[PDB]
């Protein structure tokens, strides 16, 4: 199963039409800033395909 293809799955806002966004900031879920640390209250905004 190819794993190259990827997609955003965690973004703080919806997309206005014809708007691209390729930022790579860990999505904060809790009330503590991620500061580049994934794990608790922090999720990577992307997810791949199999």
């Amino acid at each position, epitope marked *: 199963g190819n794993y190259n293809y990827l997609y955003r799955l965690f973004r703080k806002s919806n997309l206005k039409p014809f708007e691209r966004d390729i930022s790579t900031e860990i999505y904060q*879920a*809790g009330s503590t800033p991620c500061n580049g640390v994934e*794990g*608790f*209250n922090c999720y990577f905004p992307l997810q791949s395909y*199999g």
Partner: nanobody
Amino acid sequence: QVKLEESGGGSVQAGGSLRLICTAPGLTHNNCGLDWYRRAPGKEREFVSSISADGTTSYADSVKGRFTISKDKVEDTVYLQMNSLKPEDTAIYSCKTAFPYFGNSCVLDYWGQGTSVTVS
């Protein structure tokens, strides 16, 4: 207020065999990922193995070839069978899982205590 468990260790030599039991109560519903970790005395906690929500498995470089992680079809109690034990395996295992809170069903991550094995 106990949400996970770790047991199944023992005191067996290098080359011995035994089965581990990470009993997850409702991870099928929770559908969050699972990781096996271990700690060695005097050293910080180190990664051991990972299993995802879809059944993709991954093993550490110091454990690849002999460790076998598997997930139940029902009644989540994930197994980490160890075989061909080596003296480097003396450490304490632990689990980690995520649970619902604020509605979102992973946000609260929670760790079990852990169970130690001494390999001679």
